[PDB]
Coordinates of C-alpha atoms in Angstrom, one line a residue:
Chain A
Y1 CA 25.3 -5.7 64.7
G2 CA 26.3 -2.2 63.6
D3 CA 23.0 -1.1 65.1
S4 CA 23.7 1.3 68.0
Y5 CA 21.8 2.2 71.2
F6 CA 22.7 5.9 71.3
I7 CA 23.4 6.9 67.6
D8 CA 20.3 7.1 65.4
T9 CA 20.7 4.9 62.4
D10 CA 20.2 6.4 58.9
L11 CA 19.6 4.6 55.5
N12 CA 23.4 4.1 55.1
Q13 CA 23.7 2.6 58.6
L14 CA 20.6 0.5 58.0
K15 CA 21.9 -0.8 54.7
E16 CA 25.3 -1.6 56.2
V17 CA 23.6 -3.2 59.3
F18 CA 21.2 -5.2 57.1
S19 CA 24.1 -6.2 54.8
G20 CA 26.0 -7.5 57.9
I21 CA 23.0 -9.7 58.7
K22 CA 22.9 -12.7 56.5
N23 CA 19.9 -12.9 54.1
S24 CA 17.7 -15.9 54.7
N25 CA 13.9 -16.1 54.6
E26 CA 13.2 -19.1 57.0
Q27 CA 9.6 -18.1 57.7
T28 CA 6.3 -19.5 56.3
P29 CA 4.0 -17.1 54.4
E30 CA 1.3 -17.3 57.2
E31 CA 3.8 -15.8 59.6
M32 CA 4.3 -12.7 57.4
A33 CA 0.6 -12.3 57.4
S34 CA 0.4 -12.7 61.2
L35 CA 3.5 -11.0 62.7
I36 CA 5.3 -9.3 59.9
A37 CA 2.1 -7.8 58.6
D38 CA 1.6 -6.4 62.1
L39 CA 4.8 -4.3 61.6
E40 CA 2.7 -2.4 59.0
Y41 CA -0.2 -2.6 61.5
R42 CA 1.3 -1.8 64.9
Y43 CA 3.4 0.9 63.4
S44 CA 0.8 1.9 60.8
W45 CA 2.4 1.1 57.5
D46 CA -0.6 -0.9 56.0
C47 CA -1.2 2.1 53.7
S48 CA 2.0 1.6 51.7
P49 CA 1.3 2.0 47.9
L50 CA 2.8 -1.2 46.4
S51 CA 2.5 -3.4 49.5
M52 CA -1.0 -2.9 51.0
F53 CA -2.5 -6.4 50.3
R54 CA -0.4 -7.7 53.3
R55 CA -3.6 -8.7 55.2
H56 CA -5.9 -8.7 52.2
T57 CA -6.3 -12.2 50.6
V58 CA -7.8 -12.2 47.2
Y59 CA -8.9 -14.8 44.6
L60 CA -6.5 -15.4 41.6
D61 CA -9.4 -15.2 39.1
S62 CA -7.7 -16.8 36.1
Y63 CA -10.1 -19.7 35.4
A64 CA -13.1 -19.9 33.1
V65 CA -14.8 -22.2 35.6
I66 CA -14.4 -21.5 39.3
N67 CA -13.5 -24.3 41.9
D68 CA -11.4 -25.9 39.1
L69 CA -7.7 -25.1 39.1
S70 CA -6.9 -26.7 35.7
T71 CA -8.9 -24.4 33.3
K72 CA -6.4 -21.6 33.4
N73 CA -7.3 -18.8 31.0
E74 CA -4.6 -18.3 28.3
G75 CA -3.8 -15.1 26.5
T76 CA -5.3 -12.8 29.2
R77 CA -3.8 -10.6 31.9
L78 CA -5.8 -12.3 34.7
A79 CA -2.6 -13.5 36.5
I80 CA -1.7 -9.9 37.3
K81 CA -4.1 -10.0 40.3
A82 CA -2.1 -12.9 41.8
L83 CA 1.3 -11.3 41.2
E84 CA -0.1 -8.0 42.6
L85 CA -1.3 -10.1 45.5
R86 CA 2.1 -11.7 45.5
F87 CA 3.6 -8.2 45.4
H88 CA 2.4 -8.0 49.0
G89 CA 1.8 -10.4 51.9
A90 CA -1.4 -11.6 50.3
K91 CA -2.0 -15.3 50.7
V92 CA -2.6 -16.2 47.1
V93 CA -5.1 -19.0 47.3
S94 CA -5.9 -20.1 43.8
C95 CA -9.2 -21.8 44.8
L96 CA -12.2 -20.6 46.7
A97 CA -11.3 -21.1 50.4
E98 CA -11.6 -19.3 53.7
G99 CA -8.7 -17.1 52.6
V100 CA -10.6 -15.9 49.5
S101 CA -12.3 -12.6 50.4
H102 CA -11.7 -10.3 47.4
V103 CA -13.0 -11.9 44.2
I104 CA -11.4 -9.7 41.5
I105 CA -13.6 -10.3 38.5
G106 CA -11.6 -9.9 35.3
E107 CA -12.8 -10.3 31.7
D108 CA -15.6 -12.8 32.7
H109 CA -18.4 -11.9 35.0
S110 CA -20.7 -14.9 34.3
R111 CA -18.6 -16.9 36.8
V112 CA -20.4 -15.3 39.8
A113 CA -22.8 -18.3 40.0
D114 CA -19.9 -20.6 40.9
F115 CA -18.8 -18.1 43.6
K116 CA -22.3 -18.4 45.2
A117 CA -21.7 -22.1 45.8
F118 CA -18.7 -21.4 48.1
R119 CA -19.8 -17.9 49.3
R120 CA -21.6 -19.7 52.1
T121 CA -19.3 -22.6 52.8
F122 CA -16.6 -20.2 54.1
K123 CA -16.9 -17.7 57.0
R124 CA -15.3 -14.6 55.5
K125 CA -17.5 -14.2 52.4
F126 CA -15.8 -13.0 49.2
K127 CA -17.4 -10.2 47.2
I128 CA -17.6 -9.6 43.5
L129 CA -15.0 -7.0 42.8
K130 CA -13.9 -5.4 39.5
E131 CA -10.3 -5.2 38.2
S132 CA -9.9 -1.8 39.9
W133 CA -9.6 -3.5 43.3
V134 CA -6.4 -5.4 42.3
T135 CA -5.4 -5.0 38.6
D136 CA -5.7 -1.2 38.6
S137 CA -5.1 -0.6 42.4
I138 CA -1.4 -1.5 42.4
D139 CA -1.1 0.1 38.9
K140 CA -2.4 3.1 40.8
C141 CA -0.2 1.9 43.8
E142 CA -3.0 1.7 46.4
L143 CA -5.4 -0.8 48.0
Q144 CA -9.0 -0.2 46.9
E145 CA -12.0 -1.0 49.1
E146 CA -14.7 -3.7 48.3
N147 CA -17.7 -1.3 48.5
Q148 CA -16.2 1.2 45.9
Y149 CA -15.1 -1.7 43.7
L150 CA -18.1 -4.0 43.7
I151 CA -18.5 -5.6 40.3
Chain B
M1 CA -7.4 -39.6 -3.8
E2 CA -8.3 -35.9 -3.3
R3 CA -8.5 -33.4 -6.1
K4 CA -6.0 -30.5 -6.0
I5 CA -6.7 -27.4 -7.9
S6 CA -4.0 -26.5 -10.5
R7 CA -5.2 -24.2 -13.3
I8 CA -2.4 -24.6 -15.8
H9 CA -2.3 -21.6 -18.0
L10 CA -2.6 -22.8 -21.6
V11 CA -0.6 -20.5 -23.9
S12 CA -2.0 -22.6 -26.9
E13 CA -5.6 -22.5 -25.7
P14 CA -6.3 -19.2 -23.8
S15 CA -10.0 -19.7 -24.3
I16 CA -10.4 -23.4 -23.3
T17 CA -8.6 -23.6 -20.0
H18 CA -7.3 -26.8 -18.4
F19 CA -7.2 -27.8 -14.7
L20 CA -4.8 -30.6 -13.7
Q21 CA -7.1 -31.6 -10.8
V22 CA -4.8 -34.4 -9.8
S23 CA -6.5 -37.3 -8.0
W24 CA -3.2 -38.9 -6.7
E25 CA -2.8 -42.2 -5.0
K26 CA -0.5 -42.8 -2.0
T27 CA 2.6 -42.5 -4.1
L28 CA 4.7 -39.6 -5.6
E29 CA 7.9 -41.1 -7.0
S30 CA 6.0 -43.8 -8.9
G31 CA 3.1 -43.4 -11.3
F32 CA 0.5 -41.1 -9.8
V33 CA -3.1 -40.7 -11.2
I34 CA -3.4 -37.2 -12.7
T35 CA -6.9 -36.0 -13.7
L36 CA -7.5 -33.0 -16.0
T37 CA -10.6 -31.0 -17.1
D38 CA -11.3 -28.1 -19.5
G39 CA -14.8 -26.8 -18.7
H40 CA -16.8 -29.1 -21.0
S41 CA -14.6 -32.3 -21.0
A42 CA -12.4 -33.8 -18.3
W43 CA -9.3 -35.9 -18.9
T44 CA -8.7 -38.6 -16.4
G45 CA -6.2 -41.5 -16.5
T46 CA -3.8 -43.7 -14.5
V47 CA -0.1 -43.1 -14.9
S48 CA 2.1 -46.3 -14.9
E49 CA 5.5 -46.8 -13.3
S50 CA 8.9 -46.9 -15.0
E51 CA 7.3 -45.0 -18.0
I52 CA 6.9 -41.5 -16.5
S53 CA 10.7 -41.4 -16.0
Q54 CA 11.5 -42.3 -19.6
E55 CA 10.3 -38.8 -20.6
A56 CA 12.2 -37.5 -17.6
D57 CA 15.3 -38.9 -19.3
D58 CA 14.0 -37.4 -22.5
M59 CA 13.9 -34.1 -20.5
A60 CA 17.5 -34.9 -19.5
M61 CA 17.2 -33.3 -16.1
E62 CA 17.6 -34.3 -12.4
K63 CA 15.7 -37.1 -10.7
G64 CA 14.1 -36.3 -7.4
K65 CA 13.5 -32.8 -8.7
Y66 CA 11.2 -34.7 -11.1
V67 CA 9.0 -36.0 -8.3
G68 CA 8.8 -32.6 -6.6
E69 CA 8.1 -30.8 -9.9
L70 CA 5.3 -33.3 -10.7
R71 CA 3.8 -32.6 -7.3
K72 CA 4.1 -28.8 -7.8
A73 CA 2.5 -28.9 -11.3
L74 CA -0.2 -31.4 -10.2
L75 CA -1.0 -29.7 -6.9
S76 CA -1.9 -26.0 -6.5
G77 CA 0.7 -23.6 -7.8
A78 CA 2.9 -23.9 -10.9
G79 CA 6.5 -24.0 -9.7
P80 CA 8.7 -21.1 -10.8
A81 CA 11.8 -23.3 -10.6
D82 CA 11.0 -25.4 -13.7
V83 CA 8.4 -23.5 -15.7
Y84 CA 6.7 -25.7 -18.3
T85 CA 4.6 -24.4 -21.3
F86 CA 1.2 -25.7 -20.3
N87 CA 0.3 -27.2 -23.7
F88 CA -2.6 -29.4 -22.5
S89 CA -3.3 -30.8 -26.0
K90 CA -7.0 -31.5 -26.7
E91 CA -6.0 -32.7 -30.2
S92 CA -4.2 -35.7 -28.6
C93 CA -5.7 -36.1 -25.1
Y94 CA -2.2 -35.7 -23.8
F95 CA -1.6 -32.8 -21.4
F96 CA 2.1 -32.2 -22.2
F97 CA 3.7 -29.3 -20.3
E98 CA 7.4 -29.3 -21.2
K99 CA 10.5 -27.3 -20.7
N100 CA 12.0 -27.5 -24.2
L101 CA 15.6 -26.7 -23.3
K102 CA 18.2 -26.3 -26.0
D103 CA 15.4 -25.7 -28.5
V104 CA 14.2 -29.3 -28.9
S105 CA 11.0 -31.2 -28.3
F106 CA 11.5 -32.9 -24.9
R107 CA 8.5 -34.6 -23.3
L108 CA 8.0 -34.6 -19.5
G109 CA 5.4 -37.3 -18.5
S110 CA 3.4 -40.1 -20.1
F111 CA -0.1 -39.2 -19.2
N112 CA -2.8 -41.4 -20.7
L113 CA -5.9 -39.1 -20.6
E114 CA -9.3 -39.7 -22.0
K115 CA -12.0 -37.1 -23.0
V116 CA -15.3 -37.3 -21.1
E117 CA -18.7 -35.5 -21.5
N118 CA -19.7 -33.8 -18.2
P119 CA -17.1 -32.4 -15.9
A120 CA -19.5 -29.7 -14.7
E121 CA -20.1 -31.1 -11.2
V122 CA -16.4 -31.9 -10.8
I123 CA -15.4 -28.3 -11.7
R124 CA -18.2 -27.0 -9.4
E125 CA -16.7 -29.0 -6.5
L126 CA -13.2 -27.8 -7.4
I127 CA -14.0 -24.1 -7.3
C128 CA -16.4 -24.7 -4.3
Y129 CA -13.5 -26.2 -2.4
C130 CA -11.3 -23.3 -3.4
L131 CA -13.7 -20.7 -2.1
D132 CA -14.5 -22.8 1.0
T133 CA -10.8 -22.7 1.8
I134 CA -11.0 -18.9 1.1
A135 CA -13.9 -18.5 3.5
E136 CA -12.3 -20.5 6.3
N137 CA -9.1 -18.6 5.8
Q138 CA -11.1 -15.4 6.1
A139 CA -12.7 -16.6 9.3
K140 CA -9.2 -17.6 10.6
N141 CA -8.0 -14.1 9.8
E142 CA -10.9 -12.6 11.7
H143 CA -10.3 -14.6 14.9
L144 CA -6.6 -14.2 14.5
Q145 CA -6.8 -10.4 14.4
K146 CA -9.2 -10.6 17.4
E147 CA -6.6 -12.6 19.3
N148 CA -4.0 -10.2 18.1
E149 CA -5.9 -7.2 19.5
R150 CA -6.6 -9.1 22.8
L151 CA -3.0 -10.1 23.2
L152 CA -1.7 -6.6 22.4
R153 CA -4.1 -5.1 25.0
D154 CA -3.0 -7.6 27.7
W155 CA 0.6 -7.2 26.8
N156 CA 0.3 -3.4 27.2
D157 CA -1.5 -3.8 30.5
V158 CA 1.1 -6.2 31.9
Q159 CA 3.9 -4.0 30.6
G160 CA 2.4 -1.0 32.4
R161 CA 2.0 -2.9 35.6
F162 CA 5.5 -4.3 35.4
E163 CA 7.1 -0.9 34.7
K164 CA 5.2 0.8 37.5
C165 CA 6.2 -2.0 39.9
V166 CA 9.9 -2.0 39.0
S167 CA 10.0 1.8 39.1
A168 CA 8.3 2.1 42.5
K169 CA 9.5 -1.0 44.3
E170 CA 12.9 0.6 45.1
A171 CA 11.1 3.6 46.4
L172 CA 8.8 1.4 48.5
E173 CA 11.9 -0.5 49.9
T174 CA 13.5 2.9 50.7
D175 CA 10.2 3.8 52.5
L176 CA 10.5 0.6 54.5
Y177 CA 14.1 1.6 55.3
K178 CA 13.0 5.0 56.6
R179 CA 10.2 3.3 58.6
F180 CA 12.8 1.1 60.3
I181 CA 15.0 4.2 60.7
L182 CA 12.2 6.1 62.6
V183 CA 11.4 3.1 64.7
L184 CA 15.0 2.5 65.7
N185 CA 15.5 6.2 66.4
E186 CA 12.5 6.3 68.8
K187 CA 13.8 3.1 70.4
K188 CA 17.2 4.6 70.9
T189 CA 15.6 7.8 72.3
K190 CA 13.8 5.7 74.8
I191 CA 17.0 3.8 75.6
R192 CA 18.9 7.0 76.2
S193 CA 16.1 8.3 78.4
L194 CA 16.2 5.1 80.5
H195 CA 20.0 5.2 80.7
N196 CA 19.8 8.8 81.9
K197 CA 17.1 7.8 84.5
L198 CA 19.3 5.0 85.7
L199 CA 22.2 7.4 86.0
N200 CA 20.0 9.2 88.6
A201 CA 18.8 6.0 90.2
Chain C
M1 CA -13.0 -7.5 -10.1
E2 CA -13.7 -9.1 -6.7
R3 CA -15.4 -11.9 -8.5
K4 CA -16.4 -14.1 -5.5
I5 CA -18.4 -17.1 -6.7
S6 CA -21.3 -17.6 -4.3
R7 CA -23.3 -20.8 -4.5
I8 CA -26.9 -20.5 -5.7
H9 CA -29.5 -23.2 -6.6
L10 CA -31.4 -23.8 -9.8
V11 CA -35.1 -23.6 -10.2
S12 CA -35.4 -27.2 -11.6
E13 CA -32.1 -28.5 -10.2
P14 CA -31.9 -27.6 -6.5
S15 CA -29.2 -30.2 -5.9
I16 CA -26.9 -28.9 -8.7
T17 CA -25.6 -25.5 -7.5
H18 CA -24.7 -22.6 -9.7
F19 CA -22.1 -20.3 -8.3
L20 CA -23.2 -16.6 -8.5
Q21 CA -19.9 -14.8 -8.9
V22 CA -20.4 -11.8 -6.6
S23 CA -18.0 -9.4 -8.1
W24 CA -17.2 -5.7 -7.3
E25 CA -17.0 -2.5 -9.4
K26 CA -15.7 -0.2 -6.6
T27 CA -19.4 0.4 -5.8
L28 CA -22.0 -1.8 -4.0
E29 CA -25.2 0.0 -5.0
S30 CA -24.7 -0.8 -8.7
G31 CA -24.7 -4.6 -8.0
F32 CA -21.7 -6.5 -9.3
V33 CA -20.3 -8.1 -12.4
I34 CA -22.6 -11.1 -12.4
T35 CA -20.8 -14.0 -14.1
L36 CA -22.5 -17.4 -13.9
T37 CA -21.5 -20.9 -15.1
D38 CA -22.9 -24.4 -15.2
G39 CA -20.1 -26.4 -16.9
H40 CA -22.1 -26.3 -20.2
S41 CA -22.9 -22.6 -20.7
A42 CA -21.9 -19.1 -19.5
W43 CA -23.8 -16.1 -18.1
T44 CA -21.6 -13.0 -17.9
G45 CA -23.9 -10.1 -17.1
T46 CA -22.5 -6.6 -17.0
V47 CA -25.1 -4.9 -14.9
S48 CA -24.1 -1.3 -14.2
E49 CA -25.4 2.0 -12.8
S50 CA -28.3 2.0 -15.2
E51 CA -31.0 -0.2 -13.6
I52 CA -30.4 0.9 -10.0
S53 CA -31.4 4.5 -9.6
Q54 CA -34.6 4.2 -11.7
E55 CA -35.4 0.6 -10.7
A56 CA -35.0 1.5 -7.0
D57 CA -38.3 3.4 -6.7
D58 CA -40.2 2.1 -9.8
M59 CA -42.4 -0.3 -7.8
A60 CA -43.4 2.4 -5.2
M61 CA -40.8 1.1 -2.7
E62 CA -37.8 2.8 -1.2
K63 CA -34.3 2.7 -2.6
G64 CA -33.1 1.8 0.9
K65 CA -35.2 -1.4 0.9
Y66 CA -34.1 -2.1 -2.7
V67 CA -30.4 -1.7 -1.8
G68 CA -30.9 -3.7 1.3
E69 CA -32.4 -6.6 -0.7
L70 CA -29.5 -6.4 -3.1
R71 CA -27.0 -6.6 -0.2
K72 CA -28.9 -9.4 1.5
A73 CA -29.4 -11.5 -1.6
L74 CA -27.0 -10.6 -4.4
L75 CA -24.0 -10.7 -2.1
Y76 CA -30.5 -18.7 0.9
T77 CA -33.4 -19.8 -1.2
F78 CA -31.8 -19.0 -4.5
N79 CA -33.2 -19.8 -8.0
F80 CA -31.8 -19.1 -11.4
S81 CA -33.7 -19.2 -14.7
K82 CA -31.5 -20.5 -17.6
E83 CA -34.2 -20.0 -20.2
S84 CA -34.5 -16.2 -19.8
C85 CA -30.9 -15.5 -18.7
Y86 CA -32.6 -13.4 -15.9
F87 CA -31.4 -13.8 -12.3
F88 CA -34.7 -13.8 -10.5
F89 CA -35.7 -16.0 -7.5
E90 CA -38.5 -16.3 -5.1
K91 CA -37.6 -14.3 -2.0
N92 CA -40.5 -15.7 0.1
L93 CA -39.8 -13.8 3.3
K94 CA -41.6 -11.2 5.4
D95 CA -43.3 -8.7 3.1
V96 CA -40.8 -9.5 0.2
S97 CA -42.3 -10.8 -3.1
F98 CA -41.0 -9.4 -6.4
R99 CA -38.5 -9.9 -9.2
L100 CA -35.3 -8.8 -7.5
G101 CA -33.9 -6.4 -10.0
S102 CA -34.2 -6.3 -13.8
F103 CA -31.0 -8.3 -14.1
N104 CA -31.3 -9.3 -17.7
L105 CA -27.9 -11.1 -17.7
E106 CA -25.6 -11.4 -20.7
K107 CA -24.5 -14.9 -21.9
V108 CA -21.2 -15.6 -23.8
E109 CA -21.0 -18.7 -25.9
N110 CA -18.0 -20.3 -24.1
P111 CA -18.4 -21.5 -20.5
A112 CA -14.6 -22.0 -20.5
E113 CA -13.9 -18.3 -20.2
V114 CA -16.2 -17.7 -17.1
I115 CA -14.7 -20.9 -15.6
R116 CA -11.3 -19.4 -16.2
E117 CA -12.3 -16.2 -14.3
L118 CA -13.9 -18.2 -11.5
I119 CA -10.9 -20.6 -11.0
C120 CA -8.4 -17.7 -11.3
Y121 CA -10.1 -15.6 -8.7
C122 CA -10.6 -18.7 -6.5
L123 CA -7.0 -19.7 -6.4
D124 CA -5.7 -16.1 -6.1
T125 CA -8.0 -15.6 -3.1
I126 CA -6.8 -18.9 -1.6
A127 CA -3.1 -17.9 -2.0
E128 CA -3.7 -14.4 -0.7
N129 CA -5.7 -15.5 2.3
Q130 CA -3.2 -18.3 3.0
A131 CA -0.3 -15.8 3.1
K132 CA -2.5 -13.6 5.3
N133 CA -3.1 -16.5 7.7
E134 CA 0.6 -17.3 7.7
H135 CA 1.8 -13.8 8.8
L136 CA -1.1 -13.8 11.2
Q137 CA 0.2 -16.9 12.9
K138 CA 3.6 -15.1 12.9
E139 CA 2.2 -12.0 14.5
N140 CA 0.0 -13.9 16.9
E141 CA 3.0 -16.0 18.0
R142 CA 5.1 -12.8 18.4
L143 CA 2.5 -11.2 20.6
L144 CA 1.9 -14.3 22.6
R145 CA 5.7 -14.6 23.3
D146 CA 5.8 -10.9 24.2
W147 CA 2.9 -11.2 26.6
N148 CA 4.3 -14.4 28.2
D149 CA 7.7 -12.7 28.6
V150 CA 6.2 -9.6 30.3
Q151 CA 4.0 -11.8 32.5
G152 CA 7.1 -13.7 33.6
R153 CA 8.9 -10.4 34.1
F154 CA 6.1 -9.3 36.5
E155 CA 6.2 -12.7 38.2
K156 CA 9.9 -12.3 38.8
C157 CA 9.5 -8.6 39.9
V158 CA 6.7 -9.6 42.4
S159 CA 8.7 -12.5 43.8
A160 CA 11.9 -10.4 44.2
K161 CA 10.0 -7.5 45.8
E162 CA 8.2 -9.8 48.2
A163 CA 11.5 -11.5 49.1
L164 CA 13.3 -8.2 49.7
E165 CA 10.4 -6.9 51.8
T166 CA 10.2 -10.1 53.8
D167 CA 13.9 -10.3 54.5
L168 CA 14.1 -6.5 55.4
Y169 CA 11.1 -7.0 57.7
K170 CA 12.7 -10.0 59.3
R171 CA 16.0 -8.3 59.9
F172 CA 14.1 -5.3 61.3
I173 CA 12.2 -7.6 63.6
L174 CA 15.4 -9.1 64.9
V175 CA 16.9 -5.6 65.5
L176 CA 13.7 -4.2 67.0
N177 CA 13.2 -7.2 69.3
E178 CA 16.8 -6.9 70.6
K179 CA 16.2 -3.2 71.1
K180 CA 13.0 -3.9 73.0
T181 CA 14.9 -6.4 75.1
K182 CA 17.4 -3.6 75.9
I183 CA 14.5 -1.3 76.7
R184 CA 12.9 -3.8 79.2
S185 CA 16.3 -4.5 80.7
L186 CA 16.7 -0.8 81.3
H187 CA 13.2 -0.7 82.8
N188 CA 14.3 -3.5 85.2
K189 CA 17.5 -1.7 86.0
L190 CA 15.8 1.6 86.7
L191 CA 13.2 -0.3 88.8
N192 CA 15.8 -2.1 90.9
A193 CA 19.2 -0.2 90.6

């Protein structure tokens, strides 16, 4: 493409080069988490403000009862965690699975008992985290840590 | 069969009120049972068909509007459209409320009402239903304003998140562009170094 | 007045319920315009700020307790005495036993007038609260639509940003892998040639 081997490319060159390349995302979301997330890892960009959940997989806590994906909570801003997760390479698994590692507790904290049922059935245990880990973290344009955002 | 609260304002009897607490059947255009009460004597009765419209022709007004106006007067809320002087006559047991157009005595509906002794419990139930509707409306207002505040707070939060994301996503994409720029610049520097080494190889 | 008719029971007729019309006089300490009806008689008592200040501490008990009793009862086990026209009832609760206020009610001869007041306030309150509920559904629907629209806006923003980031990263991977192939080819050429 317009990319050169002896002339350093700037933003204008990159935009023209990328525009020359056809736009097509033919890649499954796992592969963004594996290889494309490694671009922010091998070259140290995992600290980007708006896209830092690339390797962090959270729980889209939007259900009154956990392990059931039909009791979506209406009238609340609990879906922001998933979109913020979807704002990065976060594998948004709506149900408690091996992917779930950051339980972002929203307006209901009594649901922790249901989390205990699947906290042992999966290897990477999820932890009870407040809205600051997801809902306020990308609002602050960062990626909070579980220990400082517990409950 | 239910009783609907319609306190017709008696100009002739400001002291002895009259409520046309209609207990209607499953019909509106035909004869509908209209029940009345005053405070110490209720006036119930069954209205026949083809006779309530004879006075409608005496009224010399539109049909169809007749049925709707009967519903308005019988049910809660006297209709502004066709205001009738609520002359619920105790002297004849005939609650005639009439719009005497062109200054002439025109009757509206043939209501065969009878005076009774003890409407106390019926009026108790009437005003009790009124204030139970008031209480449930107040509770509805309470949870409605609770939902109003909750939805407003969630709307503000989502709006703030969306505004921040749309404002900073272009900056983040430009940062990714600069990251690619630096990576390709270092790759090209390595390529030039290897080319120079090959020139001396 | 805010003549809210609240149901109370009779002493001899518990099943037949009088409606204690809890009114307002812009103050709550002075009780309310206590109008009562049975369908056969009227009890329109105009109790004012004359049996409150002195009656609060007459029985060696605090005004705060007296006003609390007024708020908790005048606004349960209710009992009205028709013979004396005196609204007193047995408040058989914890450390409460007395004639609640010297409410010597007034009785007008015509129950129809107090029934007029009761029905008028009842229907006016129904209409006002129904209009309140109507515009509250309106506002609730407006805010629900606004919140859903902004949530969908954030959905679209997140999807578009993720797609742009993904395609930029994929194009960058293509370019960088080609550059690394060039680098290793140059390594081989330097090693051999």
